[PDB]
Amino acid sequence: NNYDGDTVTFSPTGRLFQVEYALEAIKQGSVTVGLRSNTHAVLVALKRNADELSSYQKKIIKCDEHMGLSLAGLAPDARVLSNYLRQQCNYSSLVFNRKLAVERAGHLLCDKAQKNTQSYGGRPYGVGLLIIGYDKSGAHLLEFQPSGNVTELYGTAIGARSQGAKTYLERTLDTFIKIDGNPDELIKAGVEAISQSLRDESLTVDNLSIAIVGKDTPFTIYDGEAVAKYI
Amino acid sequence: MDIILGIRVQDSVILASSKAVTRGISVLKDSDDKTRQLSPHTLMSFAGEAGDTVQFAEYIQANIQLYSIREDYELSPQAVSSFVRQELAKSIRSRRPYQVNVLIGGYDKKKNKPELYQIDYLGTKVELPYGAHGYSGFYTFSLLDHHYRPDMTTEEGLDLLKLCVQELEKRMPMDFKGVIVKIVDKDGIRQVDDF
Amino acid sequence: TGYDLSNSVFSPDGRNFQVEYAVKAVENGTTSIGIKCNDGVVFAVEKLITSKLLVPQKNVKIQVVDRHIGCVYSGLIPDGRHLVNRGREEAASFKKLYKTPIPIPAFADRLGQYVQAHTLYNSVRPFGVSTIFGGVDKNGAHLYMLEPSGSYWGYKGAATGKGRQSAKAELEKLVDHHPEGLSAREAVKQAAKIIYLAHEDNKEKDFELEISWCSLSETNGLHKFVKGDLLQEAIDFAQKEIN
Amino acid sequence: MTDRYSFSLTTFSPSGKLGQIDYALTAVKQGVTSLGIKATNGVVIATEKKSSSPLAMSETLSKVSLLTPDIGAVYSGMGPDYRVLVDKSRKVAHTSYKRIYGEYPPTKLLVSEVAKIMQEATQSGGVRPFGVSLLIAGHDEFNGFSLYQVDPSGSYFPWKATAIGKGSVAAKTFLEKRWNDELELEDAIHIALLTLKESVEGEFNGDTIELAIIGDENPDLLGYTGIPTDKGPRFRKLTSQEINDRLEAL
Amino acid sequence: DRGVSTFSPEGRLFQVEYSLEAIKLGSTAIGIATKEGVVLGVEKRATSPLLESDSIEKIVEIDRHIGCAMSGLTADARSMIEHARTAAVTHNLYYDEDINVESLTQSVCDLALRFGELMSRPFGVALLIAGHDADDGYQLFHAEPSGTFYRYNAKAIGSGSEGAQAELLNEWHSSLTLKEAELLVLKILKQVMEEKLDENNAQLSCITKQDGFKIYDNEKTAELIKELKEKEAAE
Amino acid sequence: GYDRALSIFSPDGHIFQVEYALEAVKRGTCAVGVKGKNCVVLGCERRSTLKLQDTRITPSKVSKIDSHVVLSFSGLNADSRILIEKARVEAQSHRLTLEDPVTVEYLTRYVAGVQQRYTQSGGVRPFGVSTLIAGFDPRDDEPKLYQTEPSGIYSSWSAQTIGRNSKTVREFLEKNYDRKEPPATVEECVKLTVRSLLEVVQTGAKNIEITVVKPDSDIVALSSEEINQYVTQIEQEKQE
Amino acid sequence: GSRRYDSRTTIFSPEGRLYQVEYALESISHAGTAIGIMASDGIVLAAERKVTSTLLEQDTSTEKLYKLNDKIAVAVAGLTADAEILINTARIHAQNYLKTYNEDIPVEILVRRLSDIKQGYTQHGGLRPFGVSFIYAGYDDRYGYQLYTSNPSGNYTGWKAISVGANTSAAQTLLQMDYKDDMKVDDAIELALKTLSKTTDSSALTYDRLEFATIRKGANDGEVYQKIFKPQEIKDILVKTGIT
Amino acid sequence: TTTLAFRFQGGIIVAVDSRATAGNWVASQTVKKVIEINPFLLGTMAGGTADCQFWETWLGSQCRLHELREKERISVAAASKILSNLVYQYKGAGLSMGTMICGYTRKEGPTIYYVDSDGTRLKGDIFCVGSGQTFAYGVLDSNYKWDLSVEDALYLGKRSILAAAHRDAYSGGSVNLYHVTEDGWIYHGNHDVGELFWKVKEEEGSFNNVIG
Numbered sequence A: 001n002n003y004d005g006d007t008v009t010f011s012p013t014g015r016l017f018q019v020e021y022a023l024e025a026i027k028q029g030s031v032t033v034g035l036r037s038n039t040h041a042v043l044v045a046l047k048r049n050a051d052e053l054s055s056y057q058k059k060i061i062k063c064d065e066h067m068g069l070s071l072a073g074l075a076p077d078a079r080v081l082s083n084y085l086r087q088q089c090n091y092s093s094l095v096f097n098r099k100l101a102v103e104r105a106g107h108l109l110c111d112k113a114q115k116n117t118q119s120y121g122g123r124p125y126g127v128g129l130l131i132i133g134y135d136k137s138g139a140h141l142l143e144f145q146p147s148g149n150v151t152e153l154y155g156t157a158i159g160a161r162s163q164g165a166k167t168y169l170e171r172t173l174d175t176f177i178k179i180d181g182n183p184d185e186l187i188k189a190g191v192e193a194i195s196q197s198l199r200d201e202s203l204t205v206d207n208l209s210i211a212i213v214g215k216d217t218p219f220t221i222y223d224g225e226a227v228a229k230y231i
Numbered sequence B: 001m002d003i004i005l006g007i008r009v010q011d012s013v014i015l016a017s018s019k020a021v022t023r024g025i026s027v028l029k030d031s032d033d034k035t036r037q038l039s040p041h042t043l044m045s046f047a048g049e050a051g052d053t054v055q056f057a058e059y060i061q062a063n064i065q066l067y068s069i070r071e072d073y074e075l076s077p078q079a080v081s082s083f084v085r086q087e088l089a090k091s092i093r094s095r096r097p098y099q100v101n102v103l104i105g106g107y108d109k110k111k112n113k114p115e116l117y118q119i120d121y122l123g124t125k126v127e128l129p130y131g132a133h134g135y136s137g138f139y140t141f142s143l144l145d146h147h148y149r150p151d152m153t154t155e156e157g158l159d160l161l162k163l164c165v166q167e168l169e170k171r172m173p174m175d176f177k178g179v180i181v182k183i184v185d186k187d188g189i190r191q192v193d194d195f
Numbered sequence C: 001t002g003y004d005l006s007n008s009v010f011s012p013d014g015r016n017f018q019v020e021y022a023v024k025a026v027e028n029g030t031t032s033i034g035i036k037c038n039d040g041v042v043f044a045v046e047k048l049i050t051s052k053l054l055v056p057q058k059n060v061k062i063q064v065v066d067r068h069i070g071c072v073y074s075g076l077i078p079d080g081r082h083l084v085n086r087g088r089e090e091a092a093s094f095k096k097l098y099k100t101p102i103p104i105p106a107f108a109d110r111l112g113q114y115v116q117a118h119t120l121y122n123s124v125r126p127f128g129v130s131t132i133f134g135g136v137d138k139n140g141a142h143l144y145m146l147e148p149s150g151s152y153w154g155y156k157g158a159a160t161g162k163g164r165q166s167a168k169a170e171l172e173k174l175v176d177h178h179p180e181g182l183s184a185r186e187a188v189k190q191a192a193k194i195i196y197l198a199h200e201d202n203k204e205k206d207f208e209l210e211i212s213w214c215s216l217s218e219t220n221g222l223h224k225f226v227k228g229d230l231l232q233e234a235i236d237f238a239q240k241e242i243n
Numbered sequence D: 001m002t003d004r005y006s007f008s009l010t011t012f013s014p015s016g017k018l019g020q021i022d023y024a025l026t027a028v029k030q031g032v033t034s035l036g037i038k039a040t041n042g043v044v045i046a047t048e049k050k051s052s053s054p055l056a057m058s059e060t061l062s063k064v065s066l067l068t069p070d071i072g073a074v075y076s077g078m079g080p081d082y083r084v085l086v087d088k089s090r091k092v093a094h095t096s097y098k099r100i101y102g103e104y105p106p107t108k109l110l111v112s113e114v115a116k117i118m119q120e121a122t123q124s125g126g127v128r129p130f131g132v133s134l135l136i137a138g139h140d141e142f143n144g145f146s147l148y149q150v151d152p153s154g155s156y157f158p159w160k161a162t163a164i165g166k167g168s169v170a171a172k173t174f175l176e177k178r179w180n181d182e183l184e185l186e187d188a189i190h191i192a193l194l195t196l197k198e199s200v201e202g203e204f205n206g207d208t209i210e211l212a213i214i215g216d217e218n219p220d221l222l223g224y225t226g227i228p229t230d231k232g233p234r235f236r237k238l239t240s241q242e243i244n245d246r247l248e249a250l
Numbered sequence E: 001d002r003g004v005s006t007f008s009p010e011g012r013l014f015q016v017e018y019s020l021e022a023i024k025l026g027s028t029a030i031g032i033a034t035k036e037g038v039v040l041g042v043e044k045r046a047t048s049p050l051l052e053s054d055s056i057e058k059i060v061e062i063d064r065h066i067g068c069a070m071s072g073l074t075a076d077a078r079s080m081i082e083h084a085r086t087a088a089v090t091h092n093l094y095y096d097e098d099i100n101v102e103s104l105t106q107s108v109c110d111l112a113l114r115f116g117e118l119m120s121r122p123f124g125v126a127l128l129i130a131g132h133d134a135d136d137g138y139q140l141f142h143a144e145p146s147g148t149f150y151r152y153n154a155k156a157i158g159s160g161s162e163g164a165q166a167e168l169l170n171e172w173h174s175s176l177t178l179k180e181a182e183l184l185v186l187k188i189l190k191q192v193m194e195e196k197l198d199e200n201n202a203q204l205s206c207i208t209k210q211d212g213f214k215i216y217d218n219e220k221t222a223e224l225i226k227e228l229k230e231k232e233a234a235e
Numbered sequence F: 001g002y003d004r005a006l007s008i009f010s011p012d013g014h015i016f017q018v019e020y021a022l023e024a025v026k027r028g029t030c031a032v033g034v035k036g037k038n039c040v041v042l043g044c045e046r047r048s049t050l051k052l053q054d055t056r057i058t059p060s061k062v063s064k065i066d067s068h069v070v071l072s073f074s075g076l077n078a079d080s081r082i083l084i085e086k087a088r089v090e091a092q093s094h095r096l097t098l099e100d101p102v103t104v105e106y107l108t109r110y111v112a113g114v115q116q117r118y119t120q121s122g123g124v125r126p127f128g129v130s131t132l133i134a135g136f137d138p139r140d141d142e143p144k145l146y147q148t149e150p151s152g153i154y155s156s157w158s159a160q161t162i163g164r165n166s167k168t169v170r171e172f173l174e175k176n177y178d179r180k181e182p183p184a185t186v187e188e189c190v191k192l193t194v195r196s197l198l199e200v201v202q203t204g205a206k207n208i209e210i211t212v213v214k215p216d217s218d219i220v221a222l223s224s225e226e227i228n229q230y231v232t233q234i235e236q237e238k239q240e
Numbered sequence G: 001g002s003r004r005y006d007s008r009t010t011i012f013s014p015e016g017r018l019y020q021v022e023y024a025l026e027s028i029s030h031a032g033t034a035i036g037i038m039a040s041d042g043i044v045l046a047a048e049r050k051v052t053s054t055l056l057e058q059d060t061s062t063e064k065l066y067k068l069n070d071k072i073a074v075a076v077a078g079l080t081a082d083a084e085i086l087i088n089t090a091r092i093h094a095q096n097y098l099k100t101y102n103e104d105i106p107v108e109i110l111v112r113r114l115s116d117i118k119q120g121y122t123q124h125g126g127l128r129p130f131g132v133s134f135i136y137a138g139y140d141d142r143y144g145y146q147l148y149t150s151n152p153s154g155n156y157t158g159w160k161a162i163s164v165g166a167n168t169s170a171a172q173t174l175l176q177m178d179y180k181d182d183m184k185v186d187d188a189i190e191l192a193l194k195t196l197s198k199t200t201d202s203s204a205l206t207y208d209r210l211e212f213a214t215i216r217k218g219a220n221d222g223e224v225y226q227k228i229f230k231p232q233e234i235k236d237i238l239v240k241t242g243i244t
Numbered sequence H: 001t002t003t004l005a006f007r008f009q010g011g012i013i014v015a016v017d018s019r020a021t022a023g024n025w026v027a028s029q030t031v032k033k034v035i036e037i038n039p040f041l042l043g044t045m046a047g048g049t050a051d052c053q054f055w056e057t058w059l060g061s062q063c064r065l066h067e068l069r070e071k072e073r074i075s076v077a078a079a080s081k082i083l084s085n086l087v088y089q090y091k092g093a094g095l096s097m098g099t100m101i102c103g104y105t106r107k108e109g110p111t112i113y114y115v116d117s118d119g120t121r122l123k124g125d126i127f128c129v130g131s132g133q134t135f136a137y138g139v140l141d142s143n144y145k146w147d148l149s150v151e152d153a154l155y156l157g158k159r160s161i162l163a164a165a166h167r168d169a170y171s172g173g174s175v176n177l178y179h180v181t182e183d184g185w186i187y188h189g190n191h192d193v194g195e196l197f198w199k200v201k202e203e204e205g206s207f208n209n210v211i212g
């Protein structure tokens, strides 16, 4: 009310309203799902268009051969944060000849987002990110929120109606976690998960967006006729 | 670059400047004009390090032209010479100094008098009846000391100048491919085409 | 009025309302505690399990500074990380210049001054965390607790978060019942019990326990996490006490 | 972080007033009375030493300050503002004059430099004006003796005699009746003590009054001998005893 | 007042949303993409009859293979075009090749959110960027001050945008010839424009692989206007 | 440095500081530009509440940017000097690097760009000035007349006016100027310019300034008597 | 942050006026009147000191009239402290020009640069403008004798006779009445004083409440002299014109 | 290097050799020493290879930006001055370039500008640049007339490079010819000195110093 003019101001109950308003931009964004087994880690994302004449806004971004994310909210902020991740992964490779741990990737994003919430003039990031990756400790899935909070999970979803897919994955936990050495089945589980967030619209060939990374699989993205297999 | 001369007479200033541009064992050009018009009644000849000369001349030209437009008024030769001197005086203590020597010939319309200023690359200014830069002085000064009079006409000055060029063409080691001569007076600047 | 809209502005009372508002954010956060013992310190924290989908053991909240200091906090988790990052830089430069690892009281003031600095200007926000931290140095064991205002003191026991009052009460009993001192291995068990008792103030979601410790004899003066058999032994001790 | 106040905190109001300067002058009005009188052969500046507590040692707090050997200053208003102005004033006398010309600045020019500092606090970003008026007395070879008043705006005026602060309106009237152009220095000290008694309420003695003169050169206060041209400081601070001697024949 | 980079309670940046209102006040611009080329057309909208309309420059070349139309506060577009041209030429210097249309658009959109308390406010102009490259062929992009860009088969921006967009929804198909597209832009511009459409108050342009980006003459457009009127009367 | 964003969007999509700068232009004295077949004429109003003026030394309303281009304005006088200075410097800088004087379009584009920069730069307000820039490109005889405004937009005009009561004189020009046949001579062009100012001015004494620009750096300002003859001639034809 | 306390000194009103400039002019209208009159053989500068006290040192005082160089002087109206900042800048600017061109600075060039400084404070920087109006009186070999005025807006204009500060409306009407072009210095002296005498808010105009200065060619042959009048010289010139 | 370009009745001829050397090591015999800047502008290279190659392609990018901004092809004078002002900024740093900016525009006509790395900029009708410039001058000057035909002018340019290629140890490989007309530049082939020397010797009867 009187305490939402900028990010530097606390409310009387101890809330940061600008950070909460940035969180609201994620809820308006299109749904995206993330899940993983022990061998692989999968991202599924529902893309969104302006109208029938427009293209579908790309949700998934590669960060390295072994890491990438999906987005929900302000796309330009995702481009800034992804580009920062691309540099950090690249710094680790050039200087230490070392693939950047997915956990460190989260710690770095957390600290970058935080600085924007404690200084005058700046604003919080208005996007949420799901980061998947395979490193020296196996598969990983992370959830980033622009408050700074990063969380490691087996599965999750963010965006509009993300609660449906999040409930499904909470039921299916025991099943999909043991889908080892089988990419197509882990995707099928992720596609069925995102389907629990659909209303009036179904998954079409230029609507769906899948990305996978794992033991003997680099981070790759599937679109167009390559996802027709999963409808 | 090399030879630049100047003679102030009763009613005008006359500047002569060599035409040759040499680099290594080749005369690349034999028709080079080593001068810039700073204002309608002010002319500057220049000589020195390659590149620096034209870069400096044009930079001064731009500044004087800028002044003229701003004030709708022509600076006096004395005022222009002082500006040029200060620019060179700044330059000499820079990281890379301009290695350029200039002569400034002008006609002051308020005084109705011709004026000739000699300025070296250090920023050393002197007003003179006749002037030269480089090795040219070593021949011309003693010659002018003898033949120069303060009340000479423009025609007398050109003959005096022919005498200088002849002496240089006889005793100078290098072929400087003759000179371009220009006159500055009450009516402005004009070039003598047959010299 | 309007005295509470800007940081670093004094009210007619002589108070900085923005710092007091930051304390509210700390009170909203999960419970964390610190127990000073014979030859070291013990830290413990409550991790709320929001969902089945959270990977157990893999959302670590306690942080090490240098090789001999542990830090835990309640409130805005990112603000706590920023403070530790600064703590690590402060410790690094101290060791760079003076060779010896940073003493705990020296470290305590480095954080204290930094947090206090964020109450001096309206262009920055106060920290939304109370930090419990400490370790072992040349003079022995020290436990500290730092607050948004920059205020810190040494402690025998410390607690902050939603269940601070329950934990404080339980801590006061240990201090009274053990005047000669508490052992490191005892303090780990007690820490577990106090977190489980403090969980009564946050009992909708069940939780995950996380403990760490520095001890001159048990961990050789270095900060380590409590895992495996020693962790499960501490959990079982706590489970037996609630029933 | 960083000073985000890069804008003026003193601005013109619709009526044409500069609010902060007016309010600074209001602070000066609340301040304790101080005065200055100019004689033929000297200048006197005086003020009441308002003690904050009887446990406080008022000798450690100097309201009258030496700026140069021939220039002194006193004030009315906020003491802390005055103290830093004296520091800056002393330094500017060296940096912008003595280190260039090898001699001390004349009174008028030092005053001009102080005024500049006070004017900038009226226009620069993120600052308030100084809450003081100064009276500066001094001597220099080519101008002789002189007395100047400097206000929070940065304006300065020369005076034969004047007073500033609490009871300045009455004190100025008293000085108009007594001031002539034939006043000797001793006569001016006498009139200064008379004028100050009116505004002071409690104790009136050498311990509650602070008074300094700009008069003859003082070779005994120089600290060395050998150079004929160096004859000593014209600024002298009257002692507690020296004031009480003049209060008997009052 | 309030911060320039402030979020609304709904999760949108106030200044970005307000700049979008400025673009709705701008003159109409339409773009259509075909397999034979991409067509760009704009409403000039002279404020007075004494104003020489040919000096109104709302269609602009970025490179030989990339063109650009604008709508809104058109003065703001100058530095965007300046950046785009530099980006295109710089890439050619570093890689001895044409730059992808998508990569050009992304580079322009990176400027968009570089505002706050960098420039003092967002851009108040939207751009239609049309071009061709060897990889993705003929392309049309809509670049906003939010920092977002969508590819479009067809797109209208400005005051008559929502009406023109609904018309493009019906008329566009994947087999449209270049000539068919030219007429379609003229047809839809004539519908949404205030004053009567002619060669002086409207301007066409296209980009083809063979001939590159070309702004049409007033003589060439005038004939396409005459051809359009005749075809509508013929049934 | 002072950083404040002074020029910002409002809910309805307007930048009020830019729009309020246009109000300053509307307050300024009227200025008019008319281009003929072989010339451009710049007319300017001078308010007569100021007697005891010294017209020798008082800043003239029309300024030379180069020997071939001129700039008149409407709005804040002090603001116009800053734009004129920058334009004059760029004019000499162009001659220095391109070895050719500026075109009128280029000089306008530059001035308009400067104005635009001040509408989205922190710490600054927009220029409260609109300009009329007129001249002839090097080695060209086609007349050029351009207009700029605080927002930064610029455009070419057959004839245009700016300043106070400019909507009245624009109304006059819109019916009195034929695109198919512009003023064929210098006299015709000056007369149409003076006529248009006489719709708004008051007295044709020391209130009107006229400057004529012709090809190849031929610029001259008319004196009182020369202008007064146009005023005397127009009034006698009017009584009909 | 600090946005809360920003007055925004450099913005437009809805009417297209600069608030702070308008308010600075309102400030200046309460300052002591200063008059400049330009004759064919010189220039007069007359100014009224702000309500004087009898114990003010009059002879060693300077409030209104300042020397910029040997050929240019200024009369001030507004905040003295602000004026001195600008005067020292103008004094330096004159010396820079002399150093560069070996010629005394033309009056207008000095006036333009000082006015350009004032303009800057109204467009950028977020600071308050200078609350000062100047009357420039000077000579150069291009235009001869010249009078200018500048104000907080940074706008300057040339004059034959002009007043600034208090009661300019009444003062300008009186000057417009009795001024003519063939006027001499001694006549202009009399006009300047007579005008102040009628427009003053005081009871009677006396020597101690005035500052006076002429710029004549009344030296020996083709050179300009600046005379800043002493107290006794103002007393005499006041008797000589029969005001006291 | 040997590079030349001269002005004549029918436009501009530009001829260069194709040799690159590192000391006495012949590094390449197939180096392109003419840089095509646009259909109407050419740039010749002599001195440091990287310096010339890098900054002349950069010059092309600046010329492209001029015609995008100004909707008009850049003048030869303006193009040459961009390059000369650039190298002047690096004066003393050690750049080594002797270049010639050739082209035709409507306002200028056929124009040649000499630009070198110490900042010299000269307009002129004939220039030879490089280690073998004097050898090229000798043949070119002695046979040059303004009234030369296009056929004869092409041959003289070719024959001058051959003269230098023969005598100068640091010139050779092959001759690259260019003709610049009102319509633009035209490429007139690569001519290997291996075959060209003997062909010219036999047909012309020159080069009697050489064992036939």
Ligand SMILES: *[C@@](C)(CO)[C@](*)(O)[C@H](CC(C)C)NC(=O)[C@H](Cc1ccccc1)NC(=O)[C@H](CC(C)C)NC(=O)[C@H](CCc1ccccc1)NC(=O)CN1CCOCC1
Pocket: H001, H002, H019, H020, H021, H022, H023, H025, H027, H028, H031, H033, H045, H046, H047, H048, H049, H050, H052, H096, H130, H131, H170, H171
């Ligand atoms: C005639 C043909 C000869 O003068 C021309 O002038 C040609 C101009 C054409 C090629 C554009 N000039 C040269 O061939 C030129 C002469 C030269 C050499 C060195 C400095 C300045 C001028 N040669 C080169 O530029 C060669 C060309 C390469 C070998 C194909 N390059 C070098 O000599 C390089 C880079 C020189 C250099 C310049 C500035 C800083 C560092 C290095 N040097 C080497 O490759 C080193 N060398 C290779 C052989 O192994 C030993 C190390």
Ligand SMILES: [Mg+2]
Pocket: H164, H165, H166, H167, H168, H169, H170, H171, H172
């Ligand atoms: Mg050879």
